[PDB]
């Protein structure tokens, strides 16, 4: 069974099964369950001192390491999970990309737009599924699917 990049692994913690996607960085207890020209995402990105660009609307100067910036990632994708905050007030208040104006929504896109593995993330994940953090010069996302 189970859709691409998705695998089984044990809790560690727990010692029930959870289901992981290694493309995706998502993880979850439940089960999870073709590829469309075109799929639309919103995103939060953290970034850190080692960014392409290390500055932001935010903060001219980012002097956060990679370290603490996954910190920030697994804090947000914990308020998100939690229903303390959702996706769209996080990225408007926190996201390290002009995005944020948007609510984080990048638009729609197809394969050859985007850093690859923001891509790769993007295509893997079902309308309305969220990824875990996510890896590109830019710094750290989490990745909405919203179409």
Do not use: N, Y
């Given at each position: 069974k189970l859709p691409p990049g998705w695998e089984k692994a044990m809790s560690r913690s727990s010692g029930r099964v959870y289901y992981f996607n290694h493309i995706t960085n998502a993880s979850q207890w439940e089960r999870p369950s073709g590829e469309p020209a075109r799929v639309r995402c919103s995103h939060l990105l953290v970034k850190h001192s080692q960014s392409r660009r290390p500055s932001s609307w935010r903060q001219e100067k980012i002097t956060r390491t990679k370290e603490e910036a996954l910190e920030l990632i697994n804090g947000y994708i914990q308020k998100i999970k939690s229903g303390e905050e959702d996706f769209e007030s996080l990225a408007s208040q926190f996201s390290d990309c002009s995005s944020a104006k948007a609510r984080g929504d990048l638009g729609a896109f197809s394969?050859?737009?985007?850093?690859?593995?923001?891509?790769?993330?993007s295509?893997?994940?079902?309308?309305?599924?969220?990824?875990?953090?996510?890896?590109?010069?830019?710094?750290?996302?989490?990745?909405?699917?919203?179409?």
């Open positions: 394969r050859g737009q985007m850093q690859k593995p923001f891509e790769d993330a295509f893997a994940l079902r309308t309305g599924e969220m990824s875990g953090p996510v890896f590109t010069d830019s710094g750290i996302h989490i990745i909405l699917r919203t179409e």
